[PDB]
Amino acid sequence: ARKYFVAANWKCNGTLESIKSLTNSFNNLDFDPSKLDVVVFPVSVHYDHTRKLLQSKFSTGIQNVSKFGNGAYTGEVSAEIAKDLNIEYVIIGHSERRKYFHETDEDVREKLQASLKNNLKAVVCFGESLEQREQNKTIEVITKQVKAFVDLIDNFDNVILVYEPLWAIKTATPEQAQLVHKEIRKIVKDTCGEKQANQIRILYGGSVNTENCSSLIQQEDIDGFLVGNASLKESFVDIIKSAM
Amino acid sequence: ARKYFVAANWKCNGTLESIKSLTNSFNNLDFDPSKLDVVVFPVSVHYDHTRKLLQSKFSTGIQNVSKFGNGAYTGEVSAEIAKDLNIEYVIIGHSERRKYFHETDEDVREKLQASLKNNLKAVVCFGESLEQREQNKTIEVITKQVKAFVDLIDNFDNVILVYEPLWAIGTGKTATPEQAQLVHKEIRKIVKDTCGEKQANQIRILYGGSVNTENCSSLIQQEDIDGFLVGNASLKESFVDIIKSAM
């Protein structure tokens, strides 16, 4: 029922040369974008380059978006500016922004609202710490992170969730991932409704590579991934192939 | 000297079409980039579009830069990436980043360290609040802010200071050219105290309050005001007359 969703998070990496090389190798992968979503998230200043080098079967987005609209917000990219550039997706709430730049649940909410106001699709990240999982607080913490923003979703094809097992940076088994994914879908069901919950894509955002992608994707409540370091290698196409 | 320096901070504003329009109008102004620096700072995602459309006499830059290098830093743009793209200038410590995104003196320092380490030129902003000005803390505050980072400066043409009179932004108070000049004088003294006289006389100190076509000449003709980081007025085609005040 749910369309699989494979995302490349390049984070803060890339040169124009390397992007030229990587995008070319990606273009050589034959896949149908009506059946599978494949999204590339370059660094802001690399977006136009990346978009021009990637064939249209690859969707594209940016790794952050402002909680503010246009105006006196130096260094920010608004949802309105992204929409004008036909930027399709935004990443919101990535653990590294919550960690390094003190992004809160409320910031995530307001970024999501702004993104949805301007008709962007949103990739929304959350997940518990090692200390939180060690205290058996996974459901508590994820209920709270999800309820911060979940009522803003009207179209459950246009918001994609991402579970980051920050506890593991330990290493999460496919079954352990699946178990949280199921818990998340139940949270969505009880906050938004059962049809909504069965629509929404929930991606795994722990460490995904060529050797574990098949085991992860086959899990019933794992609908794809947000891929970190493996997405900077030409063998990312094999991770893509696991979802086809 | 000192070479004037006129900078367009477009902040979070612009469309593909408005920039097309605006850059074209700017291109019609004939100035000599060896006689003054004219720098445009678009939104990161507008950098390529903006750099392509502006004639090469215009310098360009980005409104923020990361304190971290390359790696697992989602949403960040490194000094490394800016260097690879020949992005010449970066803004650091803008009051709007200190206000909304909790950017600290330490953040400013590391961003400057990272920028200079990667051969970027930095436009660095600081300034006191209403409450600080009212309590006569202007020099204490500015001295603290500048001392966060000034020892990193390795070339006093390549780092540019911006005084933001935050006490006069959105407060109901307006800073006079005379008041501005005095803070700039205060700032050049601070640099002379910490770096030396030649260093202090070399460095551009730009005014970062509200600048428009009416007040621009009154500001830049002041002895210690070497140009400006312009906000809302740099979104208009009439910005060319702000540039003209420095020609």
What oligomeric arrangement do these chains adopt? homodimer
Known CATH architecture of chain A: Alpha-Beta Barrel
Name given to the CATH homologous superfamily of chain A:
Aldolase class I
Task: Give the overall shape of chain A, derived from the CA principal axes.
Answer: globular
Major β-sheet of chain A, in short?
8 strands, parallel
Number of helices of chain A: 11
Name the beta content range of chain A.
Answer: 15-25%
CATH level 3 topology of chain A: TIM Barrel
The CATH class of chain A? Alpha Beta
- Major β-sheet strand ordering of chain A: 7-6-5-4-3-2-1-8
Largest interface, with counts of residues having CB < 8 Å to the other chain, equals: A-B, 43 and 44 residues
Rg of chain A, rounded, reads 17 Å
> Span from first to last CA of chain A?
14 Å
The arrangement of helices and strands of chain A along the chain is: EHEHEHEHHEHHEHHEHEH
GO molecular function, one term (chain B): identical protein binding
Organism (chain B): Plasmodium falciparum
Subunit structure (chain B): Homodimer.
Catalytic activity (chain B): D-glyceraldehyde 3-phosphate = dihydroxyacetone phosphate
Structure description:
2 copies of one chain form a homodimer. Chain A is 39% helix and 16% strand. With 244 residues, chain A is α/β, with parallel strands linked by helices. The first copy, chain A, has a single domain, classed as Aldolase class I (TIM Barrel, Alpha-Beta Barrel). An 8-stranded parallel beta sheet of chain A has the order 7-6-5-4-3-2-1-8. In chain A, helix 7 packs across helix 8. Chain A binds chain B through residues 9, 11-16, 43-49, 62-64, 66, 68-78, 81-82, 84-85, 87, 91, 94, 96-97, 100-102, 228-229, and chain B through 9, 11-16, 43-49, 62-64, 66, 68-78, 81-82, 84-85, 87, 91, 94-97, 100-102, 231-232. It is classed as isomerase. The entry lists the keywords TIM barrels, beta-alpha barrels, glycolysis. The assembly is dimeric. F96S/S73A Double mutant of Plasmodium Falciparum Triosephosphate Isomerase.
